[PDB]
């Protein structure tokens, strides 16, 4: 396929931000639940 | 009379993995026979083979439930 | 030259080694000197210079076969990045072991395992191939 | 039982399970060959700059592509079905034992002669004796005579369960209102383990099966002592 | 009628890549988080 | 009765840009609002009931 | 400077395919012989050797003396 | 089907049509390179002279490139074909891709 | 402007209101079965009826009043209706499978017999035979209605369609009476289960089919149908013959052979 | 079968009306008479609390939980027998 | 305008987009459930301390991945976007009913989440067998909410099947026969026929389960003369067609992708590919009881089902070898979508072969209800359906969006996923052969090593999924607009540009008969 | 036995249905219900492709029973050729 | 002109491989994971009864 150059280029720094934010959105809530599992088996 | 019974023999009427009807039929046969004998004055001893076969094959709880329902008048098979 | 989205229904240029003569020329608009070169092309090509022959080629085509078929260093980036992210996964697994998982059952204690091993050999677990077959009951040791 | 890092089947304890091992070896060889051939042809198709993109005639090569797989399937099916029917062959048992599944334990009934029955529960991990196997031991084993053909009858008094012993090649679902038959014959004494094999609720993982295979005269005395 | 073209044939905006990152983060993050919070919910009942 | 299909054809072909579900006139709008109100309100109520039923009664 | 000889110019893809499909076949045979030898036959022999002089009562007595049984001490 | 010679002959005839047009030149070469073969010198000769009648020097060079490409790893084919074509190349003043530097990546 | 013959439908809210009505009916049944309340279920039934009414109203507006049902569109609707009927046949097939499974292999709990001990089936020569004659007759009268419409005969179309509907109603009333009089219930083991669930879904389809015929009756009164264009009538007739055939299989299987 | 009738000199509305009034509705009338001659209550049988009948694994979602939806006191016993 | 366009749609592309968004969200739910499974199993002992919750997680994992991820993406998403374009049609036959097939799925998913929130969830397995799923062993609303979720998903797909069959039969150019339509179109038509016939039988079975649970019927309860095994027959009479429904559109997309990146105008052996898919469809209705070889069936029935099941390898093999024959001679373009398709061909072949192992009822006695089955079907589903989905998504993302992905990132994503899924599922073969049951929250200690590796593999695929989200973000963030796409003469769906206008084929194509 | 009272299509068809019906009576196919029959397809005798705009997509089934259809835009102007078989097509806008 | 891969491919390959090996070796050996390998050739059996 051919394509135009990016209309809004995403620099390496911007990609590092988007990737980090994406990973944290998956990892932090699950990590919070799993870290607190023992707390939950208490009630 | 053909004792040395070890266990219930293969029965060509019931050759498949599902043995429910084998247990059921021998339970019926025993109790039908015991009815005809206690009635006509004879000896339940002729019924023994069916007794041994159903006792070998049938789960205790099935026999127990069926016996309870015969006592209650709710047994749905014909005896 | 400049390809536009609104051109999608018109014949277009491609560099493909299996489609050597595309549907249009790479360059359609010609300068004065480029016009003169196309007129010279109607005479003997032996009279064209090397540079003129190259410019005729580059008007017709964008990349040569050697250019369009060149290999790249992309595999280094792909493999290296994939190993990075696989390595990052092990960080997640380290975090899980440290903060999520508690102790495993006491049956993995070394003395339990040694006793359980003897008892498996005492009951001849897998004595044909799998387990006790690998124990020498005469010499009281694992077979060599 | 299985052992650490095991790749294949548990060692066979019965002749049928021996049969299954050789049949699996036969089939897995075919599986490896076809998988490898596909991987190899993929790589061959992908490793040349030579091209041929015009239309290719298909009906010659599709004869090969159907006939050879059909032959291979027949070479699998023939031994497969031979074992199937040999498993089903009459062998007249010396003993009948019933097992009833429950949430979450098995009961056993040996009612050919006397009214012998008992429950069989997993040993909890905190109560294992040293050297005993976690999640596999039971309090009351299914003692059985070795080297004799035994009729198992399997049912349930609640939900579905399934009574399995891999090293004997056994798995028979336990269905309420139904009496399923299988046959068991151990070539050897010893302890043979299995686990409930139809999901039955929250302790499905924790209702195992332990067969204890001993000589007939020990089985008779154990039977008497269990009345 | 409706807008046509790249970035216009979708029910979410791509006009600002950082707003988009937030929206995609909430969207896929909520789906991925939900089972963990259902497990927490069931554990916290008993 | 008399065949008044022509009158209805004129009405529903009038060049007024209305979608077919509203092109009968203001009664369509009323019936649409009742339907959508019952659907959206009922859906919120069902979510309330889920919240209620999600706990042993805590 | 001598001329170059005419090389084969046609059917190069088909020729390559023919040669390697045959090689693929010969390997598959060579592997089947190896797998029968390293796995299937090994298994038949292990089971036959194991049971040839197997004494089930001696095995039981060993297990019984090791203390493994509920029914036999 | 048809002999090799019969195949080559109807491709020679195709490109030798005196009033062959540009579309037909492209259609011919783009169809030809789909087959499992490197075209015989006599076919390439006819195609190059069609380029000449169409006053298209660049397509003549591109045809030489696609000959080299169709040979794949058979590195001996292209030099043989160029050898067989040198009288035509000289006559028509066609420079090879190598003489033009177009083989550099 | 298009130059194909197919129908680009105006954007519509009824797919969403239908989907939400499905949510409300199912969560409503859950609330009724487990939380002793009919409220959600009643809202869902209401929104479902409103959705069906406005959706099919709009199809009538698009076809009779706006002219979008070209022959190509009508041909697609023919396929759609046939495929819908096929899916409904397979739905009934599952209940017939259940019936034959249980009756061909009656378990010990039944007495090991069919019909089970303690079950006294209806006499298939009484109301069940009457119901059979009623639905068969209605297949004849709906065929008369179809031919009258094709022949351009308004009065006899209406008369034959009215007779068809009356018979559908007669079947429904007879079946409701039989339900009340039956000495067995849906809780009478697998005999009652198969009997009432299979005849009950069939009765629901008779009610659906009768409603569809009634829609056609009022559309006919309003002159919507032409002598050559009347697919809603054809679809209702196909659906009605499906309902008749399902009854014949129920009669032979459950009422007669299962007695 | 060809049935035993036999018109097809062309098909139409007139033939299907003929079949409607000449065969189909007469059949309904005859079956309606047959049914009205064998209506009248069958005497209900002794109640026997068979365990495969009168199933109750969960109360019904209406009434007192113990009555089927179209319960008929004359012929439908409860698990405990006929109603009073 | 937003509500008119996105809630009241009658447009096949926008509806397709809704389905792809829905399916992608469901895929994150299903992936999180799969990671909870593997976390519980990743070391010996108990993690949740509540195996009812474990069972609920396993059950929901399957329903989400099947009904809310694979079927909506393949049929609702790629089917709606591509089928009308590939036959030159202006939309689907029933464009408004099509929107209700979409909007039934969020309520279906809501019912499934409700089942997991109320009471203790439906910890049943996705088979929902009674009596475990009945009102004594699963009292309360959870299982009924699951049944109703299935009802709504079933209606959505039945109506969708009616739509696709009608569209594909009725709305081609008048000169185009069925043997001139692309293979993906065939694959959707055949999937739709399987859905039409099979889902009503599931609907009948789960309805019977609903009435046994709430109306005191006894279809499945021996106390009333019922039979739990009848439910299994009805379920699997649907469930075997279902596994072919899950893969057939994938086969269609793989044909297109392999043809395209081989530089070919057509797949090898078109009519054999049509024959093979039709044969697979037909045979897919006569094999179901291979899901029941341990229930106590007569030996001759087990011999028939063994034999009929094996027959399927013949037409499936024709398709595999025809994909290889499509590669043959190609100008191979090593695009990320090509990598997905090549991974598909090999990993699908592995899983199909272990399925042939399982078809042997005598061996299936030992392998049934063990991880060998889990390994079989995750090779055909996670390395078959998912790889075809990822291949089609990467391939057609520029058509749907107008923007290009970064190909290097997409190749990195493929590489991570390929490692992760094989590390996850390959060791499960050993666990199954050595007797580890499926549906277990913990295992005898001998099974520890392979469960540990399998769980570590599951985290690698998590990293791939997170990266996929970033890659989609980067493409919309950078806005590289498509210019030129090769091979439009044999890939009609690209010929209206990227993205195609809201209305396409307002003037239909011209195709003469000659 | 036989009044009237049922409208005919001639009386009551409307909208696009009526346009199709009237055009068919005239032997015309403005809404593309029929497959066009090919000409010999030479440059002298090109297939004539009606359009309401200045381009239309052609699909060419080059040989009878080919399963592969060859798709391309035909534009107003000089006839164009199928890229697979060369048969000629010319747009006739109206 | 040189692209991303020409400029950084070597370093990405080297660093990624080194990082991957180091962190998986650490995870596998240093944090207390019980792989439960076979006792064959490894465990001295000990009296249990
Ligand atoms: C995409 C989904 C999918 C697909 C396509 C398949 C395909 C097949 N499966 Fe699969 N299967 C499942 C998903 C699938 N399966 C699921 C989800 C389950 C579990 C359900 C549950 O219990 O939850 C399952 C369970 C399952 C069982 C039950 C095992 C048990 O529970 O004990 C069996 C048994 O016969 C089986 C067999 C097969 C076969 C023979 C195929 C065949 O169609 C495969 C044919 C393919 C090939 C053979 C490879 C390509 C062919 C060649 C290269 C030609 C040459 C080959 C030969 C000559 C052999 N499957
Ligand atoms: C001419 C007859 C028409 C019947 C109309 C009566 C209301 C039922 C509505 C029809 C739905 C059809 C099937 C529903 C299943 C059960 C109803 C079966 C038919 C019926 O009506 O059965 C009645 C019981 O109804 C009962 O339990 C309760 C019935 C009401 C609750 C139904 C709730 C369940 C609905 C689930 C639908 C799922 C659909 C999925 C599709 C995909 C029988 O009455 P009885 O007192 O037991 O015996 C008679 C004794 N004198
Ligand atoms: C509790 C909840 C359940 C309640 C169900 C209630 C009853 C619903 C009864 C069904 C009524 C259907 C009315 C449809 C009217 C619209 C119609 O009939 O539309 C026709 C098109 O057919 C069409 O769409 C055909 C449209 C298909 C209709 C299918 C109807 C059957 C489906 C019923 C639902 C099934 C549920 C099954 C449950 C197990 C319009 O075209 P024509 O007729 O040619 O007219 C044009 C001429 O005038 C031109 O000259
Ligand atoms: C299958 C899913 C895979 C998911 C793998 C998750 C990888 C880890 C992501 C990190 O998650 C965070 O981890 C912190 C610990 O590192 C937690 O902080 C917790 O622990 C801290 C340190 O002890 C305290 O400071 C905080 O208050 C306390 O919430 C925090 O809540 C959680 O969001
Ligand atoms: C605007 C669009 C549509 C939105 C409609 C929203 C309607 C909200 C109605 C809420 O009313 C509730 O109704 C419950 C039932 O739903 C009642 O429960 C009652 O209902 C039962 C029977 O009818 C009784 O048995 C129980 O005691 C009792 O809790 C309860 O008092 C009340 O909180
Ligand atoms: C008023 C109407 C005339 C219809 C018309 O031509 O406008 C006539 C013609 C056919 C009639 C219907 C048919 O005769 C069938 C029914 C006969 C019943 O005796 C009355 C209602 C019944 C439904 C009739 C009502 C009414 O008299 C109808 C509808
Ligand atoms: C697989 N079935
Ligand atoms: Cu009992 Cu699983
Ligand atoms: Cu299957
Ligand atoms: Mg099972
Ligand atoms: Na665990
Ligand atoms: Zn052509």
Residue numbers in the entry:
A (entry chain M): 1 to 43
B (entry chain H): 7 to 85
C (entry chain D): 4 to 147
D (entry chain B): 1 to 227
E (entry chain L): 2 to 47
F (entry chain J): 1 to 58
G (entry chain I): 1 to 73
H (entry chain E): 5 to 109
Give the text the authors published on this PDB structure.
pmcMammalian cytochrome c oxidase (CcO), as the terminal oxidase of cell respiration, reduces molecular oxygen (O2) to water, coupled with a proton pump across the enzyme molecule from the matrix side (N-side) to the intermembrane side (P-side) to create a proton gradient across the mitochondrial inner membrane. Electrons for reducing O2 are transferred from cytochrome c in the P-side to the O2-reduction site, including heme a3 (Fea3) and CuB via the two low-potential sites, CuA and heme a (Fea), while protons for making water molecules from the fully reduced O2 (i.e., 2O2-) to 2H2O are transferred to the O2-reduction site from the N-side via two proton-conducting pathways, D and K as described in Figure 1. In this paper, the cyanide-bound fully-oxidized, mixed valence (three electron-reduced), and fully reduced (four-electron reduced) forms are abbreviated as CNox, CNmv, and CNred, respectively. X-ray crystal structures of cyanide-bound CcOs under various oxidation states showed that the O2-reduction site controlled only the Ser382-including site, while the low-potential metal sites induced the other changes.
In the CNmv, only the Fea3 is in the oxidized state (i.e., CuA1+, Fea2+, CuB1+, Fea33+-CN-). The heme a3 of the CNmv was located at a position halfway between those of the fully-oxidized (green) and fully reduced forms (red). The structure of residues 380–385 in helix X of the CNmv exhibited a multiple structure composed of the structure detectable in the fully-oxidized form (ox) and the one detectable in the fully reduced form (red) in a ratio of 58/42. Asp51, Arg438, and Glu198 did not contain any minor components and were identical to those of the fully reduced form. Thus, a significant amount of Ser382 in the fully-oxidized form structure in these forms (10% and 30% for the fully reduced form and the CNmv, respectively) is not hydrogen-bonded to the OH group of the hydroxyfarnesyl ethyl group of heme a. In other words, the structure of the OH group of heme a is controlled by heme a, not by Ser382, the structure of which is controlled by the O2-reduction site.
